[PDB]
């Protein structure tokens, strides 16, 4: 059976020097593989600044950082192939904004997470203060992948990430992402250290 894309990548508008990422998810029988194309050519995670992350659920993420004007702004494609003769694809473009040429209402992170040390068993609240029009959605990434918010110790409070009863496992490099219809901004990433 032909594969189907259950989550299409979305156009991204990002500031020069920032982080861009596209998400794609596909499934099928036989199970499909996902590849990313840029200007019609395969993208390889072997090249610097480009990273391809796979996760269970048929998920592939293309992450680019830092983005360079003239180099990374292009139409991309997610292509899901089953290896037996069928493929499907979905397009998404990366638009890069230099200087103050951002769309009006583009998300601004006025305070991102800062370097923090927390004692085991203590609660930490990581700040992400962002503004935009529309009001931005906020989500959290640790070590390049979305934080699993189904963890009962993790929750969002007005966009801030709360980790209760911290464990050594929680340590890592966190960033928040502020997104709306006008663009996407990643905060600088910072270390959470858990002191035992």
UniProtKB/Swiss-Prot annotation:
Cysteine disulfide links: 24-78, 128-176
Q: What name does the UniProt record give this protein?
A: Tyrosine-protein phosphatase Lar
What does the record give as the function of this protein? Possible cell adhesion receptor. It possesses an intrinsic protein tyrosine phosphatase activity (PTPase). It controls motor axon guidance. In the developing eye, has a role in normal axonal targeting of the R7 photoreceptor, where it negatively regulates bdl. Inhibits bdl cell adhesion activity in vitro; this effect is independent of its PTPase function.
Organism ancestry? Eukaryota, Metazoa, Ecdysozoa, Arthropoda, Hexapoda
Q: Describe the inactivation phenotype.
A: In the eye, axonal targeting of the R7 photoreceptor is disrupted in approximately 80% of axons. Double knockouts of Lar and bdl partially rescue the R7 axonal targeting phenotype.
Cell location: Membrane
Q: Which residues are glycosylated?
A: 143
Q: What superkingdom does the record give?
A: Eukaryota
**Which residues does the annotation say bind heparin?**
37-49
What is stated as this protein's family in its record?
A: Belongs to the protein-tyrosine phosphatase family. Receptor class 2A subfamily.
């Amino acid at each position: 059976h032909p594969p189907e894309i259950i989550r299409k990548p979305q156009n991204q508008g990002v500031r020069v020097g920032g982080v861009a990422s596209f998400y794609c998810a596909a499934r099928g029988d036989p199970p499909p593989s996902i590849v990313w194309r840029k200007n019609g050519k395969k993208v390889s995670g072997t090249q610097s600044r480009y990273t391809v992350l796979e996760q269970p659920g048929g998920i592939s993420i293309l992450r680019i950082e830092p983005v360079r004007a003239g180099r990374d702004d292009a139409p991309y494609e997610c292509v899901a192939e089953n290896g037996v003769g069928d493929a499907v694809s979905a397009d998404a473009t990366l638009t890069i904004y230099e200087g103050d040429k951002t769309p009006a209402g583009f998300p601004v992170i006025t305070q991102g997470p800062g370097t923090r040390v927390i004692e085991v068993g203590h609660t930490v609240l990581m700040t992400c203060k962002a503004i935009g029009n529309p009001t931005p959605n906020i989500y959290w990434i640790k070590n390049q992948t979305k934080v699993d918010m189904s963890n009962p110790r993790y929750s969002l409070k007005d966009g801030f990430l709360q980790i209760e009863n911290s464990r050594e496992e929680d340590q890592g490099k966190y960033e928040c992402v502020a997104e709306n219809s006008m663009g996407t901004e990643h905060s600088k990433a910072t270390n959470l250290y858990v002191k035992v």
